[PDB]
Amino acid sequence: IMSASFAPECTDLKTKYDSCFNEWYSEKFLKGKSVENECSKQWYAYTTCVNAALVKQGIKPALDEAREEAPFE
């Protein structure tokens, strides 16, 4: 099986965002070849799917806050 998103309705748009990333990670970002997010599409799909579901999630406020902190002081 693959990695589930917390929103079962995004598990897929997720998988794809992931795939193009691994490609852009290993083959481009890691080798200095990076250039203009070769995945606007896949990300946006997934990232807007997950954001929709997140607002209904009580954990969101806690997550936002945690995103403000810098654990790497």
């Binding site: 990695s3 890691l30 990076s34 997550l63 995103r67």
Partner: protein, 160 residues
């Protein structure tokens, strides 16, 4: 509050590229049945050039009844996993702790990945820190009572 640091090291027989990737795609796997979902909340490349990534994960667990009554109905935690990847010096930092339940306790996990130019290895440095929802108060409050209750008992008994 109360804190308990724990360090431990591990060396991987592969490069930073090989290991880092596995980090990002570590789920699912033989010993992660408790990991339910992982999402990539936000990713990007800073002014510095490193990959900045925040991922929300949700792991499950089975509380020990004989010490679980008090706590309501809870079989799972939300966790945040922030990370940084420096493509230059081939190193990646990975902070990661719980988001909900910080009330009872709060676990934190700093793990770093350094590639050892020489040994073709990627060294991983894990530091885990437990703390507590609680504890700030009493004992200290109390102590002092024991301090004065005796600061009084000695002086009180003295007179007699």
């Amino acid at each position: 509050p109360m804190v308990l640091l724990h360090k431990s090291t591990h060396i991987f027989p592969t490069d930073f590229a090989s290991v880092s990737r596995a980090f990002f795609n570590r789920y699912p796997n033989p010993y992660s049945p408790h990991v339910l979902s992982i999402d990539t909340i936000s990713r990007n490349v800073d002014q510095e050039g490193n990959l900045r990534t925040t991922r929300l994960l949700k792991k499950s667990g089975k509380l020990p009844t004989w010490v679980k009554p008090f706590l309501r109905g809870i079989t799972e935690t939300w966790i945040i996993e922030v990370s940084v990847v420096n493509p230059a010096n081939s190193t990646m930092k990975t902070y990661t702790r719980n988001l909900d339940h910080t009330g009872i306790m709060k676990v934190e996990e700093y793990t770093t990945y350094q590639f050892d130019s020489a040994t073709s290895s990627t060294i991983a440095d894990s530091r885990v820190k437990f703390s507590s929802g609680f504890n700030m108060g009493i004992k200290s409050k109390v102590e002092d009572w024991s301090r004065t209750k005796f600061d009084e008992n000695v002086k009180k008994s003295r007179m007699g």
